[PDB]
Design a protein around this ligand. Structure first.
Ligand SMILES: Nc1ncnc2c1ncn2[C@@H]1O[C@H](COP(=O)(O)OP(=O)(O)OP(=O)(O)O)[C@@H](O)[C@H]1O
Ligand SMILES: [Cl-]
Ligand SMILES: [Cl-]
Ligand SMILES: [Mg+2]
Lengths: 593, 595
């Protein structure tokens, strides 16, 4: 029982445990109410709404949870502004997420086994975020790690299922511990580089492994009676290696389908993603994104085999699109961090699916000019331990309206441009975006993580015949159907990625911060947004009909219910209708002319 | 950097011990799938041998066949598979993938996919954990044998799963590695913590010894300086894996509110037994064992302690102790030892997820009982073998002779268990790990029994005193809301016959008959004819037991044995039981032919 043991106990006994508990509860309740999963009584007061949530205790008798909140013009999102108080005889602030959920779900029905996992994820989030917060007291690399807060919406934004406290201290991105990758050799019976990636992959091994070290690895392979020409080389997260590959691949290790080689020469360090590591020794070198079998936000951190296969072809396709577009290339100067090489070992087995794979991505340091710095886009709405907006200084310096205008211009507009001019919808969540700035002045946007979340509407492409052919890349694409991967047959996929991903779940978080902290009204926020959208597309008259057909000004739209998906089995279409703030903003924008 | 433990794991996986373990795990798997009728291969009979042809389908839905040779044995019709398991499609190849074997076989035969995946995972983890153990083993007192029999269960195809241990934890806590460990002491608030039923006085006394007055005093002073009242807490020892990987992360809210308070480490070192949640005191061998909660899955079940069973443990042991001390045969002739679970404590809340997760039962050290020339061996040790295949009882058999040794064994070991059933209506769970042979240089002396709290069944009409039967309904709220057959008490007399045939014989004593036949050419028929003679010899001394003995029907031709593997492949099923022949039946027929 060492110092890390002591740390963990102190973290829990501290005020940071209370604070983290209150936050998970807050976020949980906002989400249940917003999505209409529960339906409290609502008593209106001047600004606030008092919600009364019904439940039943273990004894099948009545209980109320009280809290005060707001229903916001920004997509009708709910903010809970107070403690969540359990009323039976006497009032007390809720101590147990588990108790809260089960009392509340005796009244409203859910699938029990889903409830159980969800409760476990919320508890683990509290646990893991408690010690992150207890452990905290810039520039891009530091900021990635030091914004430890994680997701503003998802009740369990920290679960890390499969990490107990020591692994968490070792691997959690908040702690910034250097680590080494494990190099293995993987037999070509089951291993493949990314589609049409062979030349690039062979070149990247030269710089990544090192030339001499690679020769020495091949000699060792020969010294076992194996033929190095029959193998590819894959880096593996050391946690993944020790806790997953060794036990689940034993059969491949015994027959030399997999050969342990050794440790990377360079040290690496986790990013917000944690399956994504930067080279600490040489920061110009590519990041590596590797398989991790760990459950964070209800999904395993595995890399899908079809997705790994296609990552390089996708980055090459996108890079061409952007390079032939004068606005994106010359004016907004958008940055795409290319996932330019990939490799994987994929056997039939269901249990190991997506468990060993790697994608290399360009460092954002390749792109940063001198004088330029970068911040993760979800950092723009982040706060200091004492609750001060991390962008406070900048806003004081540049003014709120001017800073926000520039932000919309350098960051939001290019994303929407891509949707309307190209029918290409990049996953627009804050975690995919990085703002490049100069002393806090917004300059250009960088985008990443294409291989997982990209969507597109084929008829809008400039060249349909240049659209990468997915069916030739993987048997899974080949046997798949329309809408399963990347391609939508519905034009509404475009409207939805913009309203839902870009605005409701990401940029909208900024509007909350500016309203509550600087008294900059949400109506004025969406005003600026409409104005900049309009200033852009007025320069592109041929886009007029198409802009309209996308309907960004629709008075309401159907938004994903992300939390409901966690409580229910069928989950076919879980959407709820919400108001669209752009609608009213545009009506006022029109009157104002 | 990757260390020497990493290097070991890799060498073990890359070695020949991996091939043997894989082969063994496949063998036990196929044996039980055929035995329980989960699959029904074609059977082609040679003189003795059977060729088994098992159907499957590959992923392209093309037929495949698995082939092996084996036997159906007179001992309960158990299946022995004597040859490698070969996959036949185009060519023939020994099967390398337990997952593939199971996937192909279950494309033909329907199971629950979900259960199939877990089972495959457990089989792979078994292979993985046992490979490291077989690889580390080299080429003996009681304590030394507990940790040196590394083979685990001869029936269950995954006998090593240990779901929740990766290789490093396995090295630390796996009983094969005999690593000394410290218990973690916690204080638990009496709002949720209780001593076992009517155990308060014995518990207070046992904390004196186990913690020490000095430490306990210092423990109380620590709680007091946190502004908590030392009189509101009990004290529970926790496995250090359980504390760090389970309690700390799942009890955070109890730690926050001082429902649970960390005190420190035990003074003494402990070492795991075959059970791994049961720890012996290494520093002071006469001190009691600790059986503690562990949330890991071995053989498909969580290693938690059921709260109701922790609560009734001290009372069950007092009850059994009294039954023995008033019976001349058991007390005087047999001299049976019952290692008493004499104290227990737990912290138990509502939460479903932590159910059974923090609990402790203390048990008497077998060293309390051993005479000056006596030693002890775990009962499943009797059928264990050395890495090279020599039965570990080999020297003893050479010294006393086989028939003489087997008769003494039956007379001192098997008879008193059966006596308990017939005279007392009490069936202790009689499997191999519940029994300890006490011997003098390999001469069988007497039997010691353990693990009462979970396993025991009884038939109320058979009790010598039905009113001395402990009233469980008063001990825990789960017993009081429970129904007949739920815990400990069976309404059917067949409960008793099944505990003898199925637990004592089929899954335990029968394994010895296999070893004697295959190693020494001692025929299974002779083995069972000795068992019958000895049972008869005993009961001819107790005429008052005749009609009771008859009604139990140990000589019935066929009976219903548990299907243990089937249970791992289905959520719900109609039976769980299958009919097997009883070797005591024919043996008795023949024993009768003497007169
Ligand atoms: N012959 C055997 N009979 C019963 N159990 C055995 C035998 N051989 C090995 N074992 C193993 O002993 C282990 C004991 O686990 P268990 O938790 O049931 O014991 P306990 O209740 O803690 O005492 C099991 O994993 C079981 O598989
Ligand atoms: Cl980083
Ligand atoms: Cl012999
Ligand atoms: Mg046992």
């Amino acid at each position: 029982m060492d110092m890390y043991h002591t740390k963990i106990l102190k973290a829990i006994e501290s005020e940071d445990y209370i604070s983290v508990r209150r936050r998970v509860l807050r976020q949980l309740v906002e989400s249940l109410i917003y999505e209409g999963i529960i339906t409290p009584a609502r008593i209106e007061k001047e600004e606030q709404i008092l919600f009364l949530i019904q439940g039943l205790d273990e004894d099948n008798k009545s209980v109320t949870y009280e809290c005060y909140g707001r229903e916001r013009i920004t997509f009708g999102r709910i903010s809970i502004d107070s403690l969540i108080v359990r009323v039976q005889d006497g009032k007390q602030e809720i101590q147990s997420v588990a108790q809260f959920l089960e009392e509340v779900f005796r009244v409203v029905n859910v699938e029990q086994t889903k409830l159980d996992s969800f409760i476990h994820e919320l508890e683990q989030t509290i646990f893991k975020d408690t010690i992150a917060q207890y452990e905290r007291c810039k520039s891009y690399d530091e900021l990635e790690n030091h914004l430890i807060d994680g997701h503003p919406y998802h009740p369990s934004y920290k679960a890390r299922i499969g990490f107990q406290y020591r692994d968490n201290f070792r691997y959690g991105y908040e702690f910034m511990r250097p680590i080494k990758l494990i190099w293995i050799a993987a037999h070509k019976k089951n291993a493949t580089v990314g589609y049409e990636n062979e030349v690039i992959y062979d070149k990247i091994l030269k710089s990544e492994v090192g030339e001499r070290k690679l020769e020495a690895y091949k000699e060792r392979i020969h010294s076992m009676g194996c033929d190095p020409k029959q193998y590819l080389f894959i880096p593996v997260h050391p946690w993944q290696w020790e806790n997953f590959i060794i036990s689940n691949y034993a059969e491949d290790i015994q027959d030399k389908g997999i050969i342990y080689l050794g440790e990377s020469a360079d040290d690496y360090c986790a990013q917000q993603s944690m399956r994504t590591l930067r080279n600490v020794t040489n920061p110009k070198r590519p990041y590596v994104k590797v398989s991790l079998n760990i459950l964070n936000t209800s999904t395993l951190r595995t890399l899908k085999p079809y997705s790994v296969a296609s990552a390089p072809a996708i980055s090459n396709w996108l890079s061409n699109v952007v390079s032939q577009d004068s606005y994106l290339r010359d004016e907004s100067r958008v940055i795409l961090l290319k996932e330019f090489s990939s490799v994987m070992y994929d056997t039939n087995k269901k249990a190991t699916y997506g468990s060993l794979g790697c994608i290399w991505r360009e460092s954002v340091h390749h792109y940063l000019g001198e004088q330029e710095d970068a911040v993760p886009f979800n950092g723009l709405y982040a706060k200091e331990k004492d609750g001060t907006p991390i962008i406070d200084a900048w806003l004081n310096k540049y003014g709120i309206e001017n800073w926000l205008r520039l932000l919309i211009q350098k960051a939001i507009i290019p994303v929407i441009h891509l949707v309307v001019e190209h029918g290409i919808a990049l996953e627009s969540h804050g975690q995919n975006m990085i703002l490049v700035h100069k002393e806090g002045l917004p300059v250009r946007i960088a985008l990443k993580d294409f291989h997982e979340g990209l969507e597109f509407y084929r008829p809008f492409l400039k060249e349909m015949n240049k659209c990468p052919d997915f069916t030739k890349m993987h048997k899974t694409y080949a046997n798949g159907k329309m809408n399963d991967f990347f391609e939508m047959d519905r034009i509404e996929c475009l409207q939805e990625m913009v309203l839902d991903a870009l605005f409701l779940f990401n940029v909208g978080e900024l509007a909350f911060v500016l309203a509550d902290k600087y008294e900059w009204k949400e109506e004025s926020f969406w005003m600026i947004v409409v104005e900049e959208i309009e200033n852009h597309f007025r320069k592109y008259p041929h886009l007029k009909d198409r802009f309209e057909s996308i309907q960004l000004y629709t008075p309401t739209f159907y938004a994903e219910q992300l939390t409901k998906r966690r409580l229910y089995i069928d989950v076919e279409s879980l959407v709820h209708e919400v108001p669209n703030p752009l609608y009213r903003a545009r009506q006022l924008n029109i009157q104002k002319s």
